[PDB]
Design a protein around this ligand. Structure first.
Ligand SMILES: [Ca+2]
Ligand SMILES: [Ca+2]
Ligand SMILES: [Ca+2]
Ligand SMILES: [Ca+2]
Ligand SMILES: [Cl-]
Ligand SMILES: [Cl-]
Ligand SMILES: [Zn+2]
Ligand SMILES: [Zn+2]
Ligand SMILES: [Zn+2]
Ligand SMILES: [Zn+2]
Ligand SMILES: [Zn+2]
Ligand SMILES: [Zn+2]
Ligand SMILES: [Zn+2]
Ligand SMILES: [Zn+2]
Ligand SMILES: [Zn+2]
Ligand SMILES: [Zn+2]
Ligand SMILES: [Zn+2]
Ligand SMILES: [Zn+2]
Ligand SMILES: [Zn+2]
Ligand SMILES: [Zn+2]
Ligand SMILES: [Zn+2]
Ligand SMILES: [Zn+2]
Ligand SMILES: [Zn+2]
Ligand SMILES: [Zn+2]
Ligand SMILES: [Zn+2]
Ligand SMILES: [Zn+2]
Ligand SMILES: [Zn+2]
Ligand SMILES: [Zn+2]
Ligand SMILES: [Zn+2]
Ligand SMILES: [Zn+2]
Lengths: 151, 152, 153, 152, 151, 152, 165, 152, 150, 152, 152, 151
């Protein structure tokens, strides 16, 4: 199950980075819509952390060894972090979250595919449930930004 | 016989069923700034609409009537017109649609209040009164969001 | 697109779930006979569940870039379920049979939903149909048991 | 000035006390299919009845009155008749008895509604209206179990 | 009171009248302490109603036929009711509740003895549980009244 | 028009604000046996009063009115008079003051009820009726604590 | 040499002491649970929607007694039966294969039969515990006997009968 | 001794009373996009303000003081100025006015902290500190909504 | 041969697994009792959860679940032994892991059989149960200082 | 008449007071593997003990007695002995100390049961029985954690 | 380094233990009007005292100290004096006794605050400030019940 | 670190790294006591995350710009991470936790002093509350390890 394991570990790195980005958005947001979106980041972070612990623990259960240091997360993740900046608009912050979410849904499709190929049906459901929710969020986020989900 | 109390309860069943459909369409097709507050707010409105619908229908049953209970009956008896879902409608326009729907229901509930008062059906009268109070409060709030007075 | 039929079955479900709700509510209202006190509130539970599937399936369709049916005309014209005027003289067991018939239809609709979404690689939609089908079938067993019959799925 | 309102509230106190007693008798003496549903349903009914009793008695106190407050006063002033407990009454018959008590109560509440309106006691008028709404809903549901229209 | 069923029915009657007396106190009470003791009667009434239902249903379980009319309760009960009087003092009202509770405690002891003698151990426990609570209440009401429980 | 309803709603906003102030003084300056029960009771009464205040004000807004919304407006339009806090007042005197305030409120709510009934503003009418009912129940209880009949 | 190993029919099943009745109850409660669960699954007919969930409530109550009586045996120094083999062999209740074609009336009459048996067993446990002076175990049997008897009344009432204890 | 800790506590009582009044005005008179989020948000702030008011007042009582307890006393002693309510004002102006009242309270709570530190009144010191911490958090968030730095 | 057969097998095996977990709950002695005694309650509630769900899926599918102790004991692959207080905590946990290993294996078989037969509902039931039991093996093994070794 | 029952109730008050003290010592002085489970567990034990203490003392009051109510009285009448706290005692020694306390309490509650039974004090009898049941369950569990039989 | 902060924490342990014992005596021996409010109120006070007790003792453990943990140590180190329970004491004298205990604890907590402030133990300092704040508020309330100023 | 803003940001870095370390322990833990200490790491992480958010938001409130990327956390933190190892014993993992907590308490002491020096009472209290809780944990962890707190 080398590929299932590998994608689970890739997920651990990327979710760790995704959390960090969402927290930056939580903190640096400024503009109309702050009062609704600030707490919404909290909800997203909670959901992301849930996936991260569950995917990492599935890897452990499969006899893997999850990335568990900031260096490992940073060097393995495909997500790039930029310095926090208050001058970003609310709408650009939300577009950043959509971008991160689009990537996560892409990674979870990969994890679904790989685990399906290897017969790891339990890991397959983990990725399917995560992808379901993340795609729902992409619809809602895109809707707030006056756009179709464009999955 | 409470003929008109019964007639107006059934009108309300039809119109509430269509009102719910319109709110659920707004819920789904909404796009633009404010989606995150207004999307779940439609859920709140739909629950309330739904509560009135079941109470009014069951008051009509209680009074010996026969509530409308098919979509055909709802469509053909409602005064509310439905249009196809369109994502290009703005938030402010979507909210305006909801206000128009609520103004109608508020007027309908007024008519039900008046009719039940005259027939001496005080229980029905109270059902309409409570529904109207809440709906008019929603109108104030929606209109305030839209930068406007309630204009009741 | 590659999900054209996934979308088609999601929309079908929206229309049929809307009509199925209408029917359950009719049963809630027009019910008369021994067992009213149990089954009357049970219809509320079914409607609640049905409404949950309705919102979720329509919203998945939106998420896939579709346009859900959202008028009573569209529900009525697209649904394969047929409505009749409410009648207090239908027996409790006839009303329960009617609900069973509706649930059999939805289980089959969800089966096709599963198969179509499965073939298009839309696994999220696949799971939505799968969860709904499971509960609907459990309901069929219970309703049939009340009626003194096997599930006969 | 509020002598009639006061008298009808005290009538309600007596009648509700006796209605409570009849419902508790049904609760205990019930036998036949449906017991498991209707036994606890009688507790729901008794709680509701007890709520009206305390509200109506305390409204009378509030208006400067003196509520009946002994079993003899309840029994002698109530229009409802009690009968000895009997396990051989059928479920259908027991539910029919509750319907009878509830119809009487719905009619008492209409009277109380009427009298309180005539004397300009709008608080008492509301108390009777709310209670009537709920009792009448119960008659619908009970009659339905019995395969009948509410026949209000 | 020949047996356990006889005492159970006696308690059904007395608990019904006890309830009525407590309800009278709830309504007719005036004086300093009203705000505490008004709601407290509700608590006592709920407890009394609990024993009432438990004891009656025990009698049914044993093959009896509980009293179930106001006439039966009033005639079989050893408690006496008087017309409501607002001019009774709050301390007199509490003293009246104590009187009722002392009677009930004594009835429950008689129920305990009879059921013990007959070997009706379920009924025995019912009376013992009820006696315990009533006696604790007598202590507390007596204390409010500046008196020893005097059981 | 609905001018008198709008006027009595606004009077209530002023008078509720001053009543709140008076109850908070009582909560704070209270001394004597009974403090431990009446001190928190004042919180409860304040929560109820603030509930009516917000509801009546927002009803006024909904009707196209403009509620009083400054302490100057409350003080100047209210019929209730305030005095400096004084720890030397007895519990009896504090509770009697609450009763007087409550009596005033019950009377204003009866005026609101009459005016709204005249103008056909049924929603406003019920708001006043609900409030009057609760306030009158409180006057019974306070008066009972003080060893007296409600004497409404 | 070594000590000879006894070969005997290890008969027991003489409800002599509290420990013995506690273990018997352990056995009977396990089988009662099994019967209740069969009624739960195989039930058909008008009343299913009320009685299907009700069996769950009864099962939970029975398991509560099972655990508490078993743990009381442990506390007193005993060794509770803890195998389906031990339960089936020591229990005086009889199990039959599941059958969908039993009326609700027949189902509830079966439950009554098991409950009557349990109440009688708990009465035995009560009497034994009392002669021994085991007042804690005595209480356990009394509490369980009380509620089982209440259920008998109710089930019998659904069936249009007196409790007939 | 406690002389100016008592003084600043009473100042806070007046200012919090007025701040409460302003927040309630904003709640009622707000119109424009953001209404549906900011309207209930004002209730949150009012509950919080009210908490400080009661705690600070009761600390003053505890210290042997006599808190201000009439609208006249609040109005005359508060440094905050009230204006007549106006629906036309924009949401962003409304939020800016709240920020203005909060900045004042934070500066008042600092003076409270300062004077209670020197005088040795450690309990009053912590009350002001906790309140200041939360008001400063609100300034950040309100300013953030308004597209600005906190600028404390 | 089918989903119905694996479902019934699970009914039998879950019944016996419950009994084993209850024996551990009762006979457990040694350091850790205070945490592992109640944990067995958690495991039993979970097991009983699957038991009822799988049994009722069987009924829904037109089957007839095993419903006597004799049917459970005979059809089950798990072997019960007599309760003994002298087993250590670490040995009792080792026993639970073996039972859970067996269950995870059965659930894989159920997953496979239902996948072939195109019975996605039953497939999902087995997939959900397997996920949880495997997670428990990880934790139990970790308490026993070992890898999951699935 | 109930002198023995009163006597044992009061003995229990003293002993439960000292037992609480010993348990709290264990809570504070525990060091070693198992701390994180056993530390909060002593809180569970203390709350249970405190419950018996208050119930038995109040039963004594109810019966006309005068419960020990000072540390001097508790210490002088308790048969349980206290030693100075020592972090150097092992977890397993601490648990053994808890077991010995509970064995004593179990024995005392049996003496209570026996005395109250002889005297016909069934309420006091039931209090000791219920307490003994729970303590004995704890002895089993504590012994199981120490790898031993309950050995009552 | 922190020997004086440790000493005062440990003094608190003894004093809080004796304070608990006094409150429990009051809880049990109380007779007179007000019993039904004050009896349970003693439970709330005991719960609060026990909170400080465990918190202060555990802070002492955390700082490397060894808390008093025996009735002998509590008794011998506490500055509070206990007397035998007396039913013949009035409610008002019982409450006055509680006030004395509380004035003592508030002085103790003031010492604790000052000592810990001098030694730069900011955590222990906050523990004392919080405890003092609450005990002082209770002194106000108890004194108000007794018709007096707090007189801190 | 010269001012309150500087130490608040130091804490943001260090709390982020401390989270990572606790999460490492949660995952790699093996040995008797796992079942207690595994969920305990969750409680610690929840608490750590609380300080992280409060301290960062206080920095924003004061007009600062908190670190908000893994790069900033890892480079600015004085805590060091190692690769996850299943072979570390329970007691060694708990000792790792203790040492992280000891550092954190020392940082919050420094934050207390710096903010007290600058008259920033609000920040002072934040550090004070955090240190109180961390010190209590050190005592309990040390107790589990058979040792004195040794602050
Ligand atoms: Ca007409
Ligand atoms: Ca019919
Ligand atoms: Ca019959
Ligand atoms: Ca404008
Ligand atoms: Cl605007
Ligand atoms: Cl050691
Ligand atoms: Zn974060
Ligand atoms: Zn985890
Ligand atoms: Zn809808
Ligand atoms: Zn309905
Ligand atoms: Zn509907
Ligand atoms: Zn939705
Ligand atoms: Zn009754
Ligand atoms: Zn009442
Ligand atoms: Zn009553
Ligand atoms: Zn009952
Ligand atoms: Zn106020
Ligand atoms: Zn409002
Ligand atoms: Zn089962
Ligand atoms: Zn157990
Ligand atoms: Zn306000
Ligand atoms: Zn207050
Ligand atoms: Zn079991
Ligand atoms: Zn089931
Ligand atoms: Zn203690
Ligand atoms: Zn007590
Ligand atoms: Zn105590
Ligand atoms: Zn502690
Ligand atoms: Zn983490
Ligand atoms: Zn935050």
């Amino acid at each position: 199950l080398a590929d299932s394991k590998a994608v689970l570990n890739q997920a651990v790195a990327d979710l760790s980075v995704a959390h960090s980005i969402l927290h930056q958005v939580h903190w640096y947001m400024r503009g109309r819509g702050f009062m609704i979106w600030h707490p919404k980041m909290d909800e997203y972070m909670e959901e992301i952390d849930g996936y991260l612990d569950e995917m990492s623990e599935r890897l452990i259960t499969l006899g893997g060894a999850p990335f568990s240091t900031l260096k490992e997360f940073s060097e393995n993740s495909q997500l790039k972090e930029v310095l926090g900046d208050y001058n970003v608009t609310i709408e650009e912050q939300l577009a950043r979250v959509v971008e991160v979410f689009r990537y996560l849904a892409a990674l979870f499709q990969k994890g679904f595919d790989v685990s399906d190929e290897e017969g790891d049906s339990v890991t397959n459901d983990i990725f399917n449930v995560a992808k379901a929710s993340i795609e729902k969020h992409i619809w809602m986020l895109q809707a707030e930004l006056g756009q179709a989900p464009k999955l």
